[PDB]
Amino acid sequence: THIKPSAQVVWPIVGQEILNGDVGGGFQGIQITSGFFQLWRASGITSELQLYTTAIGGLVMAAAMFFAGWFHYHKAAPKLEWFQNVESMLNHHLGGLLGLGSLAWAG
Amino acid sequence: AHIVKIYDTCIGCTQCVRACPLDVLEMVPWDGCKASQMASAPRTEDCVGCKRCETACPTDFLSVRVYLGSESTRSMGLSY
Amino acid sequence: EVGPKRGSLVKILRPESYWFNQVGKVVSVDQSGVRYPVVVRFENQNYAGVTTNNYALDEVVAA
Amino acid sequence: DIAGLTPCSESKAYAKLEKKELKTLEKRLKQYEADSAPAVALKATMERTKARFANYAKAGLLCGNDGLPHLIADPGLALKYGHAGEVFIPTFGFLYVAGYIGYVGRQYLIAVKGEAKPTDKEIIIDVPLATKLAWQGAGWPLAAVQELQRGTLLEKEENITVSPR
Amino acid sequence: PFVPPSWAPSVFVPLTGLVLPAIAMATLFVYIEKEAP
Amino acid sequence: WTVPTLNPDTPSPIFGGSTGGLLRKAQTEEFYVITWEAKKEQIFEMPTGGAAIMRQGPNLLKFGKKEQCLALTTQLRNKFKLTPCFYRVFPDGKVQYLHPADGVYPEKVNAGRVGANQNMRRIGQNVNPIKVKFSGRMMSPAEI
Amino acid sequence: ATKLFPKFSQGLAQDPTTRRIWYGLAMAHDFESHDGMTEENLYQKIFASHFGQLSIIFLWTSGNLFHVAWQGNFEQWVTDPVHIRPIAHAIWDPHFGQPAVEAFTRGGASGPVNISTSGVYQWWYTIGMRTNQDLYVGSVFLALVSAIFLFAGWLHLQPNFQPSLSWFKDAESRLNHHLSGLFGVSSLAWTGHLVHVAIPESRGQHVGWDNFLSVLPHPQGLTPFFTGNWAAYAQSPDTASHVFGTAQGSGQAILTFLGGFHPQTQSLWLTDMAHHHLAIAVIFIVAGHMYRTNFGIGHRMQAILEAHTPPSGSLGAGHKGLFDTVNNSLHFQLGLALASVGTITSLVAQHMYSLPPYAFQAIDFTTQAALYTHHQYIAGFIMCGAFAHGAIFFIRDYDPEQNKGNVLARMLDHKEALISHLSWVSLFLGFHTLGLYVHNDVMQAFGTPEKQILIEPVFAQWIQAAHGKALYGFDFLLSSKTSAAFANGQSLWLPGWLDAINNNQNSLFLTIGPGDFLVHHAIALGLHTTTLILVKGALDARGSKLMPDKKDFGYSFPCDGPGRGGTCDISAYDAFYLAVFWMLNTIGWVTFYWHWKHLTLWQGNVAQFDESSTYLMGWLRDYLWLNSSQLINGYNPFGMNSLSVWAWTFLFGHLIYATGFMFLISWRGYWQELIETLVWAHEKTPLANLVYWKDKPVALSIVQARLVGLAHFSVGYIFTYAAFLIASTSGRF
Amino acid sequence: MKDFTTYLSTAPVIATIWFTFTAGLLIEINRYFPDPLVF
Ligand code: CLA
Ligand code: CLA
Ligand code: CLA
Numbered sequence A: 001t002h003i004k005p006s007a008q009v010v011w012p013i014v015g016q017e018i019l020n021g022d023v024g025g026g027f028q029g030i031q032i033t034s035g036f037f038q039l040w041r042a043s044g045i046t047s048e049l050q051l052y053t054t055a056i057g058g059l060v061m062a063a064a065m066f067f068a069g070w071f072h073y074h075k076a077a078p079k080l081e082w083f084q085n086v087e088s089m090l091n092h093h094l095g096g097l098l099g100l101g102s103l104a105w106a107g
Numbered sequence B: 001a002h003i004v005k006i007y008d009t010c011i012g013c014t015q016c017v018r019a020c021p022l023d024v025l026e027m028v029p030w031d032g033c034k035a036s037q038m039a040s041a042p043r044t045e046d047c048v049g050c051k052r053c054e055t056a057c058p059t060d061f062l063s064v065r066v067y068l069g070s071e072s073t074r075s076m077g078l079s080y
Numbered sequence C: 001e002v003g004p005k006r007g008s009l010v011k012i013l014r015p016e017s018y019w020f021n022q023v024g025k026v027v028s029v030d031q032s033g034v035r036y037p038v039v040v041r042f043e044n045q046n047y048a049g050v051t052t053n054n055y056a057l058d059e060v061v062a063a
Numbered sequence D: 001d002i003a004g005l006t007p008c009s010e011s012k013a014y015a016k017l018e019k020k021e022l023k024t025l026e027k028r029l030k031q032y033e034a035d036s037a038p039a040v041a042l043k044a045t046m047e048r049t050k051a052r053f054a055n056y057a058k059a060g061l062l063c064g065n066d067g068l069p070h071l072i073a074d075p076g077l078a079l080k081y082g083h084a085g086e087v088f089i090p091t092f093g094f095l096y097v098a099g100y101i102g103y104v105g106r107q108y109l110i111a112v113k114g115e116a117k118p119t120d121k122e123i124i125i126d127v128p129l130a131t132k133l134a135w136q137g138a139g140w141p142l143a144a145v146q147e148l149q150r151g152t153l154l155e156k157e158e159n160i161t162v163s164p165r
Numbered sequence E: 001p002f003v004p005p006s007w008a009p010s011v012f013v014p015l016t017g018l019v020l021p022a023i024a025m026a027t028l029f030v031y032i033e034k035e036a037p
Numbered sequence F: 001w002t003v004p005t006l007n008p009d010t011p012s013p014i015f016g017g018s019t020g021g022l023l024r025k026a027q028t029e030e031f032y033v034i035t036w037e038a039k040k041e042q043i044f045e046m047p048t049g050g051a052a053i054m055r056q057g058p059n060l061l062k063f064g065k066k067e068q069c070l071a072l073t074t075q076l077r078n079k080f081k082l083t084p085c086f087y088r089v090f091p092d093g094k095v096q097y098l099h100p101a102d103g104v105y106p107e108k109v110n111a112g113r114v115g116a117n118q119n120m121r122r123i124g125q126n127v128n129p130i131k132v133k134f135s136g137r138m139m140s141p142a143e144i
Numbered sequence G: 001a002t003k004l005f006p007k008f009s010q011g012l013a014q015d016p017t018t019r020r021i022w023y024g025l026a027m028a029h030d031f032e033s034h035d036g037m038t039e040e041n042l043y044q045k046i047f048a049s050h051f052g053q054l055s056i057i058f059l060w061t062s063g064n065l066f067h068v069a070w071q072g073n074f075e076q077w078v079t080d081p082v083h084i085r086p087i088a089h090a091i092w093d094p095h096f097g098q099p100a101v102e103a104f105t106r107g108g109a110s111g112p113v114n115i116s117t118s119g120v121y122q123w124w125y126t127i128g129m130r131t132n133q134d135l136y137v138g139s140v141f142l143a144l145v146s147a148i149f150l151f152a153g154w155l156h157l158q159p160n161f162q163p164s165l166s167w168f169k170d171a172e173s174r175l176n177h178h179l180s181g182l183f184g185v186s187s188l189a190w191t192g193h194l195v196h197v198a199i200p201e202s203r204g205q206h207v208g209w210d211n212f213l214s215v216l217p218h219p220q221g222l223t224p225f226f227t228g229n230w231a232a233y234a235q236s237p238d239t240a241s242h243v244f245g246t247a248q249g250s251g252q253a254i255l256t257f258l259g260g261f262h263p264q265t266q267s268l269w270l271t272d273m274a275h276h277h278l279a280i281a282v283i284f285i286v287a288g289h290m291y292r293t294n295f296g297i298g299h300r301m302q303a304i305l306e307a308h309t310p311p312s313g314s315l316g317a318g319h320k321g322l323f324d325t326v327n328n329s330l331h332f333q334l335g336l337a338l339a340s341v342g343t344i345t346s347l348v349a350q351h352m353y354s355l356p357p358y359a360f361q362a363i364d365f366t367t368q369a370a371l372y373t374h375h376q377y378i379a380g381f382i383m384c385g386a387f388a389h390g391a392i393f394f395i396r397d398y399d400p401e402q403n404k405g406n407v408l409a410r411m412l413d414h415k416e417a418l419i420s421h422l423s424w425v426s427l428f429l430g431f432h433t434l435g436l437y438v439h440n441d442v443m444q445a446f447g448t449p450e451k452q453i454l455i456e457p458v459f460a461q462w463i464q465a466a467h468g469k470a471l472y473g474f475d476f477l478l479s480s481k482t483s484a485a486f487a488n489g490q491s492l493w494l495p496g497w498l499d500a501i502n503n504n505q506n507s508l509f510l511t512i513g514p515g516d517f518l519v520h521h522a523i524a525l526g527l528h529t530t531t532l533i534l535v536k537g538a539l540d541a542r543g544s545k546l547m548p549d550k551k552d553f554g555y556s557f558p559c560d561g562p563g564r565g566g567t568c569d570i571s572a573y574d575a576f577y578l579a580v581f582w583m584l585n586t587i588g589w590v591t592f593y594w595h596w597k598h599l600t601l602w603q604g605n606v607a608q609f610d611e612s613s614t615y616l617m618g619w620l621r622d623y624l625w626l627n628s629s630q631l632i633n634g635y636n637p638f639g640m641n642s643l644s645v646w647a648w649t650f651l652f653g654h655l656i657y658a659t660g661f662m663f664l665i666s667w668r669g670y671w672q673e674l675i676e677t678l679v680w681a682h683e684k685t686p687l688a689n690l691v692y693w694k695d696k697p698v699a700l701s702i703v704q705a706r707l708v709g710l711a712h713f714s715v716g717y718i719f720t721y722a723a724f725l726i727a728s729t730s731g732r733f
Numbered sequence H: 001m002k003d004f005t006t007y008l009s010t011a012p013v014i015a016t017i018w019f020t021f022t023a024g025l026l027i028e029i030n031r032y033f034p035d036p037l038v039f
């Protein structure tokens, strides 16, 4: 209720360190308005260790996404018939992506 | 009506005639270029001033030149 | 065989030409009596993207 | 001294501004514990502020009634009254660097122009040649005078295109 | 001396800015729409 | 080849109509009528918007301006390799054949055609405007 | 069918669309383009049009005099010009609410009225006007003068009174008359009014057509004038204790050279202005005897120009052929007149504020602000017009064969050099003037104002020192009491001048610092950029590499189509249109600078400008935001005040300015297709289809849209600033 | 590798590298010589 969320710290150069405002909690930085602090609290994160572990996970996922992109274009490229399976695509996106995603989040 | 003029620099490419969307130009027999044909503008009254002919003209400078002039129902391309 | 030699470099003299005071290569000269028999090719394209044009013998000079 | 200005070293407004600046930083240094990283940072800014006000005064800068340093740009007043590090020397420093960039770039364009595809050497930079010219650009001023004196720097009007007039 | 009455504005302002504009617009519109003999 | 006569009772391509059709100008000033022969029923695009089915053999359509007729003329010739012809029709019953004027499309050089609006000079040989000043009206050195 | 309007262009008269109405109005004063136009008829039409313009100007002045004498408080303002607010005219609005009537009731009450910011009250008071009878008589006279110019206009166009083209071409005779009579005799007649009426009125003596002959302008009469004892006329001038309008502290001199300002009025001395007009009158009358007309003596302008050719060939054929070039080109003649009048208009703005000629003018801050901004904006438009006509001259009148090798043709031969150099200067000023402001803003934002770049305007301060100001300690010329320039003028004007130039409460050579340095370079940026745009338009008006035959298309044409990469805004008219934005930006910067420096001086804290003008946040917060409070509170949920009209106008200008953006950003094609849909809707709507249009509705043309957008943009620009300027100055003072 | 070095020689890449070098040089200078107003 008193400490202002801050997650960007600037280097002390050409006098720009003034932007590191007194946000509270013995911390100096730029006040953020993305709402991440409240999202992380809602998710139940209570340590910077959990935030660091998710960051590493996201990079592992980013590497996987870039791999998938290279693999599905240079190694195993789906044919047009595959992409034209709209009935199958909707069944998986409604049941898997959306319904499973919502079920997992409820967990 | 807009003033359309053809110049001796014409090479008889017929591109302007093919580009015209109102049939203002045509090819007439000539002896000034190797193609033995030169562009002519016998229906300028139907010209709107799109200048597509000039865009199609490849000579430097243009062999076909359009000078926007008096405005009419045809010149303004009005369907009303 | 009137006109400049093929493959020779000539400078344009036509004032309204994009390549005025610029040098191009003589692609071919029409021996037939055409108004502009010298076909010249240029490296730089004009505003229309064209890189060739026909000029009269007087409009061109070895350079 | 000049223009009725006064040395920052003797200006009272210059002194009040330095106190005003340090008092803002100090009002903030209080809310933090002595060794706290926030405290260390505010202290380093206070030291940098003290050094700036001292370094500027030592450089003999003049200050207006606003208590802020004013720069003398007249070559005559600057040299006679000790104010040449403010605009004069900076001018010859910039002119050397700016001419350096220009002469090297001109040398590059001239070199790639005699190649098969100059346009290709402008989108893909011939790094080795570019690095060579970059190092040889230190003596550009003498090279520029030697080109100006050989009449090789400029182009003949007869070879430059112009509109009909 | 060359002084208009108090009602001047109560009459001049209405005439100039409403009545005269209407009259001017009417004649002008007619002339433009008129065609050469 | 002779100047063709427009048969006004020609069958029109199948089309339910649109809102981009003729306006009051067709009844007061003039309208345009394109005609062509189709070797097979093919759906085509109306220059005024919408799909329409050309009928076997003769076909007739009416457009508000010449550009719309030539636009349809372009599609039929380029896509279906057909050879259409169009006319300008006045409200008094008068019909005027327009394209192809001589039965040979303009891009193809044809004899008999006499050059018009041609200048035996390059544009750079035009006089300065000061020379054509105070003439009967505003004119360009090119017009002289 | 062919409509009657316009009668000057059958082409337009045969246009069946709404464009005919717009173009008929837009091309009515372009006589050269009218059907069947001859050079002689061109001159006669212009001559009559000029009489018409004069008629309108004199009626405008008569109208102004009448409303002040009938609805204002001139006879009350003269009694207390320091605390009485001048009334422009009465307000009769039936849409007003009882509160608005009370808010606008002022200046001696008498109902709702507008206060005058024109400065006619101080002007007429200074020239001797003292009563509404005097104002009424003047109004009648000027109304009569207007009718004569209107009749002369009508007559000099009737047969047996239509001057020949040769008369219009008699340059040597016209210049002799305009210099000796229009300028010299007029100035001499003005000296007579000042000496016989204005000065006696300032000394408390009424001098009117009733007693002007039985009154002596000077106690010694004209004996000093005809004996050569002119100095006598300078003896015994008004003293520092002179109460303007009374014989208190009043002297007897009629021509002096005191210099500086009258102590109470803070304006120039009437005796100094009388002597000024007398001296310039003599100079002009003499100058009017230089050209040869009919008596065997005088110069032939053609011979003069033909002789001015540098012997080294540095200027080619020199000024050969220029006589005929100028004499046969009205556009060339108009270009020079606009360029000269426009520069002179800016001088009026700079000199009237620094050396106020009218009594109690410098204390009327609102009038001072209004006059400077008004003349600086009119000057900007005139300068733009000058280049526009220079570009038209090149396209319509320039004949290369008759100007071969001359200075004019040389200009065209190095146009790329001229333009490229104007491009370089503009770039330098723009990059550095912007870079220094941004650096200063960042230094202010990071809380380090001692780190900002503040270059002292030493070169300008040195000039001010030369003129006498000793604040900078340069000690030279008038600032040096041991200088000859100081001693020679010690018994003439210097004393009064030095007192004024050393007083930091007037506007005579205001003190300048780093903020003034930055804004002056911003003004230089605007002047060079606007000139670059205008010059480039005139030099490329006849042709370019993209359009080599532009001359065959005329001054104003939409474009040359999308071919050749695209050719939007390629005409010289398009260059003028783009230059107007830069001119408005330039006059905006200059008027902002003038207003802010005076607001701070008038308030008594020049330090605010000196410390806030060095960064753009300072301009936005300490000038625009801070000075807008009272104006935006002209009307609010709690009521309205006399500033309500300005609050409403301020927003009215913002609306027109933004409406211009629509004509400037959105182009014809989109609108033409929208109108076609409406034409279908009207013809398909029952009952509505019964009524029809005589002119086929069409979207505005490309050139028309650029003009309509620029007009809306320009009108909102002026209305917005005028509303802000008057409100900020009046409300604060 | 030759094609990769040619790609690294492309205008945008060289600009990023050159500007990063120039920016870095200026930043480091102000890091070791803070508040430089005069020579
Ligand atoms: C070392 C790995 C590698 C290599 C050698 C190649 C090589 C090739 N790829 Mg490829 N690709 C890869 C990985 C790789 N790819 C991956 C991981 C993906 C998944 C995204 C793809 C997806 C892909 C597609 C869809 C296509 C290619 C194509 C091609 C061929 C020509 C295009 C090209 O590469 O030009 C070089 C292109 C670039 C260098 C652009 C880089 C794009 C990045 C990802 C954008 C980054 C933007 C940044 C995040 C934000 C910028 C903001 C700004 C403010 C700075 C070429 C032989 C094209 C082809 O087959 O030829 C027609 C083709 O269409 N690739
Ligand atoms: C349970 C089945 C399933 C799931 C979960 C997904 C999920 C997704 N698909 Mg998809 N798809 C499926 C089946 C599925 N698909 C089938 C059967 C077909 C063939 C008809 C397609 C064809 C298809 C196309 C053509 C496209 C997608 C795309 C996408 C992505 C859209 C981005 C988004 O909104 O989500 C947000 C993103 C996330 C939540 C990140 C998490 C994603 C992880 C990897 C979940 C795993 C998904 C994957 C299908 C699982 C198998 C991986 C395995 C082969 C190694 C998304 C992650 C779009 C895409 O390009 O994605 C790259 C797209 O264009 N899909
Ligand atoms: C570019 C515009 C410009 C302007 C507006 C000025 C303006 C001024 N300069 Mg200058 N100066 C300039 C460029 C300029 N300078 C350049 C490019 C140089 C490099 C050589 C110099 C070198 C220079 C010197 C050495 C001196 C000045 C001085 C001065 C001041 C008096 C000079 C004078 O009498 O007339 C104006 C001068 C010019 C228009 C051009 C150059 C200045 C001349 C050549 C110097 C002659 C000064 C002379 C001795 C008068 C001062 C007497 C005494 C007080 C020394 C004056 C305010 C004098 C001064 O006040 O020093 C304290 C001085 O001695 N300037």
Ligand code: CLA
Pocket (backbone or CB within 6 Å): G046, G047, G050, G051, G052, G054, G167, G168, G170, G171, G173, G174, G175, G177, G178, G180, G181, G182, G183, G186
């Ligand atoms: C003594 C002889 C004489 C006089 C007095 C005039 C006077 C005039 N002639 Mg003219 N002319 C003459 C002889 C003369 N002419 C001869 C012999 C010929 C044949 C060769 C011509 C051929 C001729 C032509 C073709 C034209 C004129 C025109 C004009 C008018 C110019 C309009 C104008 O700009 O306003 C007046 C100009 C001035 C008063 C000059 C002063 C301007 C300064 C810069 C203003 C400064 C004022 C002061 C500083 C501040 C004022 C503050 C306060 C009072 C507001 C003007 C009233 C024009 C015309 O007809 O207009 C209707 C025009 O077209 N004349």
Ligand code: CLA
Pocket (backbone or CB within 6 Å): G025, G026, G027, G028, G029, G030, G031, G334, G338, G381, G382, G383, G384, G385, G386, G388, G392, G555, G556, G573, G576, G707, G711, G715
């Ligand atoms: C003595 C001064 C003077 C004279 C005699 C002329 C004379 C001429 N000019 Mg010109 N001009 C001048 C000054 C002058 N100009 C100035 C100062 C400028 C800069 C602004 C210009 C800029 C200019 C341009 C760009 C052009 C001309 C053109 C012309 C010629 C025909 C245009 C015309 O008059 O048609 C009629 C003029 C009009 C109908 C005016 C148009 C309407 C404008 C936008 C005013 C609208 C303002 C509006 C009322 C504001 C409302 C606010 C309210 C609601 C509160 C003509 C011979 C044109 C030309 O060269 O011919 C081809 C042309 O292209 N002038």
Ligand code: CLA
Pocket (backbone or CB within 6 Å): G423, G426, G427, G428, G429, G430, G431, G434, G525, G529, G532, G533, G578, G579, G581, G582
């Ligand atoms: C705030 C609006 C604005 C600004 C800033 C400018 C600025 C400029 N105009 Mg312009 N103009 C404007 C509005 C504006 N105009 C409008 C509304 C019109 C009417 C349509 C015109 C019409 C106009 C014309 C006709 C001409 C100009 C010209 C110019 C240039 C004059 C030379 C100069 O000053 O160089 C100074 C340079 C600058 C001020 C730019 C600053 C450098 C940048 C900001 C630094 C880089 C930042 C960073 C490193 C990288 C940012 C990008 C990032 C994504 C990486 C100049 C850059 C003239 C011209 O083209 O010059 C030859 C000219 O011909 N203007």
Ligand code: CLA
Pocket (backbone or CB within 6 Å): G655, G658, G659, G660, G661, G662, G663, G665, G666, G670, G674
């Ligand atoms: C403040 C600037 C401004 C304003 C006022 C408008 C206004 C309008 N725009 Mg527009 N626009 C603008 C800027 C502006 N635009 C800019 C900068 C762009 C560039 C992106 C565009 C691009 C744009 C497009 C592409 C379109 C519009 C359209 C419209 C119209 C929408 C229909 C409508 O609301 O009619 C009602 C009129 C109003 C709401 C104006 C209010 C005026 C007041 C309330 C009336 C007062 C009348 C007064 C009493 C008359 C007496 C005066 C007296 C002297 C006699 C509308 C009039 C659309 C259109 O054409 O219409 C369908 C359209 O398609 N605009």
Ligand SMILES: CC1=C(/C=C/C(C)=C/C=C/C(C)=C/C=C\C=C(C)\C=C\C=C(C)\C=C\C2=C(C)C[C@@H](O)CC2(C)C)C(C)(C)CCC1
Pocket (backbone or CB within 6 Å): D073, D074, D075, D087, D088, D091, D098, D099, D100, D101, D102, D103, D106, D144
């Ligand atoms: C060699 C070089 C290049 C330069 C090429 C060329 C041709 C540059 C042209 C220079 C020309 C023609 C200059 C012409 C006139 C210059 C003049 C009159 C000099 C004005 C300078 C003045 C008045 C000095 C002002 C001051 C001095 C003493 C320094 C400071 O104190 C500031 C100030 C203003 C007080 C290329 C190719 C751009 C590439 C790159 C390297």
Ligand code: SF4
Pocket (backbone or CB within 6 Å): B004, B019, B020, B021, B022, B023, B024, B025, B046, B047, B048, B049, B050, B051, B052, B053, B054, B066
């Ligand atoms: S401007 Fe358009 S309509 Fe006119 S001749 Fe050229 S292509 Fe045809």
Ligand SMILES: [Ca+2]
Pocket (backbone or CB within 6 Å): G128, G130, G201, G206, G207, G208
């Ligand atoms: Ca009196």
